[PDB]
Design a protein around this nucleic acid. Structure first.
Ligand SMILES: [Mg+2]
Ligand SMILES: [Zn+2]
Lengths: 17, 99, 153, 101, 288
DNA sequence: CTCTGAATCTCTTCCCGCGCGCCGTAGGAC
DNA sequence: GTCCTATCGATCTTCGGAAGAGATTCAGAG
């Protein structure tokens, strides 16, 4: 999900891009 | 009643439901909302892909748990693919996309 | 002049539809309103449609629908069902008056204890009006001969 | 329904009778009526060959290939009986020809 | 397959043929005594996939050593049986058929595109009245539905300078004649012609639908089904129950009805049945 | 003569689990 | 008995939902 730890993962993916 | 592993339904590979059948508890929509209320995303992903739906994944999870690795390979919930066929059986062309 | 009219009928009960119309015409003594009722059949041209030589009176319109296993006629509107045509009757009467088992082809049987089994043509019993098709019995998948009626193509 | 005839041919008496017993017993068990076995006359070829590679015309060997024939007639077949017969496999080297009607 | 987006759009008939691995013809699934799947049925082994785990139906091969090969005793391809739940088939309808959803949504998309009332389009589709297309040198409008008595008038008043079809055929011809972009431009300039908000709002809806169809790769005739794909059988199992019987399956019976009706229509069209009979068969097929 | 009002049409919707327990193609032709 | 085809192709499928929303008609309305 794009929330919580899932939001952390998505945010890392978007920042490393 | 408690279930570790047993019968799996045919049309969708989710575990059976009931006591007279070796079935597991249903994780309703309210429970999903409650999990989303916390930041638990790995818990939800496991609960709705490995434990219940992804046929290939739930065996690879079994080996790791026996091996003591405690790592999951989610893949994709098989039931979802079934949905696609039900829509692809109509005059609708719905498909996954790369980008 | 009694134009033909086409009537819907219970498939499988079509002969009973024709008979039940034949009785009701005489019982209601409307013999002067019906000429013939056609159910063409070959060794059935129209699977579930009955042709009736008739005129168009409201009494006849309700009489046909008063026969069992009859919804009604097929036409443009329910108020006035329509005849078929001039030449259509003639064509239907014209018809009412008027495949090789290739070696190697994979067949299925039509009757017998071996009916509907995956066989494969093995030889040609042609001038006998017969057949011979290999099948998979007791590992000794045996050279097995069949009647010509036992093909399924 | 026409009866089905099974003609078994083999070079061995005991093997052919074992296969025949299997077939008839299966047919009886699966509720078919079977009129068999019938021991049809057994062919016996013969061959006489010189055993001496050169001359010695009187030294010979006579050999024989005995071919045994058994007939099993199954009258009034049933789908159940036919399926049982199909799933029953017979000893190899025993030829079976099925005539139908 | 890894993915990042989901796209939904209309499916062209050739796309449906691309989906399919075979054409289901015989409306039979399995024997009532033996449990083998009947070929060219709703459960055809060579169309959707083998039933055995890694063995062909014909039994010619029972090993991974022959995986991926094609048998010639039954025609079934030997592979993983799981594929049987993913392969689809298709039924080529003997005549066009309108997609029910697009016919009777909250508005009528098919009706909205042609600006034709839902009642009248349903009347046309269910073979109740004619509709004149390509009317040419006749006092017959672009669509201008007309009844059989009205059609009986046009049959002799005019010759072949007009065309009036019935059912989904007329709607498909109208859709195939839709000059979509020119129509949208004309309507978007006609919007400024009048201040009738009661009609301006639905005109805005119509032009929005036209713009959505123009921008998307969708084409109008795709609202009319011509090939109907069949669901993979493993998603609609005919599971047995206690004793030698199979549990009833809802989708299987609907497909059986459709296949039987379409085969009857094909048989008649081969035998040149009268217009009344073929019209009734086409209506029954559409309703099935 | 239609327009821009209402009024009268059809369609969609209605908590979560959990257990029992039955009950589950039909008539007609060779 | 088996196995077949077809499915109110001569009835009336229920009246003890409410509402809420559109969509579709009409109606004085100028
Ligand atoms: Mg001899
Ligand atoms: Zn095979």
């Amino acid at each position: 999900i794009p929330a919580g730890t899932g939001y952390a993962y998505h945010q890392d993916r978007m920042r490393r891009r | 009643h408690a279930r570790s592993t047993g019968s799996y339904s045919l049309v969708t590979q989710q575990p059976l439901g009931g006591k007279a059948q070796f079935g597991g508890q249903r994780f309703g929509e309210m429970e999903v909302w409650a999990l989303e209320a916390y930041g638990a995303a790995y818990t939800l992903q496991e609960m709705l892909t490995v434990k219940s739906d992804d046929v290939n994944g739930r065996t690879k999870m079994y080996k790791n748990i026996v091996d003591g690795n405690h790592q999951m390979e989610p893949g994709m919930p098989e039931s979802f693919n079934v949905l696609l066929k039900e829509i692809r059986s109509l005059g609708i062309n719905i498909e996954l996309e790369d980008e | 002049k009694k134009r033909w009219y086409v009537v819907q009928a219970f498939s499988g009960f079509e002969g009973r539809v024709a008979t039940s119309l034949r009785e009701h015409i005489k019982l209601h003594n409307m013999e002067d309103l019906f000429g013939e009722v056609m159910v063409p059949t070959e060794e059935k041209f129209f699977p579930g449609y009955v042709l009736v030589q008739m005129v168009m009176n409201d009494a006849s319109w309700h009489l046909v629908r008063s026969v069992p296993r009859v919804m009604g006629f097929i036409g443009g509107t329910s108020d006035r069902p329509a005849p078929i045509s001039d030449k259509e009757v003639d064509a239907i009467m014209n018809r009412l008056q008027q495949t090789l088992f290739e070696p190697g082809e994979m067949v299925r049987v039509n009757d017998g204890p071996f009916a509907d089994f995956n066989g494969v043509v093995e030889e040609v019993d042609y001038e006998k009006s017969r057949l011979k098709v290999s099948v998979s019995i007791f590992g000794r998948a045996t050279p097995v001969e069949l009647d010509f009626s036992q093909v399924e193509k | 329904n026409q009866r089905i005839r099974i003609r078994l041919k083999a070079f061995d008496h005991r093997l052919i009778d074992q296969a025949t017993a299997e077939i008839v017993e299966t047919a009886k068990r699966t509720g078919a009526q079977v009129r068999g076995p019938i021991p049809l006359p057994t062919r016996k070829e013969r061959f006489t060959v010189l055993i001496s590679p050169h001359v010695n015309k009187d030294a010979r060997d006579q050999y024989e290939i005995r071919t045994h024939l058994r007939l099993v007639d199954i009258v009034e077949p049933t789908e159940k009986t036919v399926d049982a017969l199909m799933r029953l496999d017979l000893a190899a080297g025993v030829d079976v020809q099925i005539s139908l009607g | 397959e890894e993915f990042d987006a989901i796209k939904i759009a209309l499916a062209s008939p050739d796309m449906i043929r691309s989906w399919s691995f075979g054409e289901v013809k015989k409306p039979e699934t399995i024997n009532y005594r033996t449990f083998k799947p009947e070929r060219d049925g709703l459960f055809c082994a060579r169309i959707f996939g083998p039933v055995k785990d890694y063995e062909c139906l014909c039994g010619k091969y029972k090993r991974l050593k022959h995986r991926g090969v094609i048998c010639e005793k039954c025609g079934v391809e030997v592979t993983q049986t799981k594929v049987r739940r993913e392969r689809m088939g298709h039924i080529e309808l003997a005549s066009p058929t309108a997609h029910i959803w697009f016919l009777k949504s909250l508005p009528s998309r098919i009706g909205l595109l042609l600006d034709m009332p839902l009642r009248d389009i349903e009347r046309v589709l269910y073979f109740e009245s004619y509709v004149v297309i390509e009317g040419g040198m006749t006092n017959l409008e672009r669509q201008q539905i007309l009844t059989e008595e009205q059609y009986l008038d046009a049959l002799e008043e005019f010759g072949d300078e007009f065309d009036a079809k019935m059912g989904a055929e007329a709607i498909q011809a109208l859709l195939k004649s839709m000059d979509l972009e020119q129509e949208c431009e004309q309507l978007r300039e006609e919007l400024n012609e009048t201040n009738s908000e009661t009609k301006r709002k639905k005109l805005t809806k119509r032009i929005k639908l036209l713009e959505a169809f123009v921008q998307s790769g969708n084409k109008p005739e795709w609202m009319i089904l011509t090939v109907l794909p069949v669901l993979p059988p493993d998603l609609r199992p005919l599971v047995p129950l206690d004793g030698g019987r199979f549990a009833t399956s809802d989708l299987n019976d609907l497909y059986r009805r459709v296949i039987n009706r379409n085969n009857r229509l094909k048989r008649l069209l081969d035998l040149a049945a009268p217009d009344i009979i073929v019209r009734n068969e086409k209506r029954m097929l559409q309703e099935a």
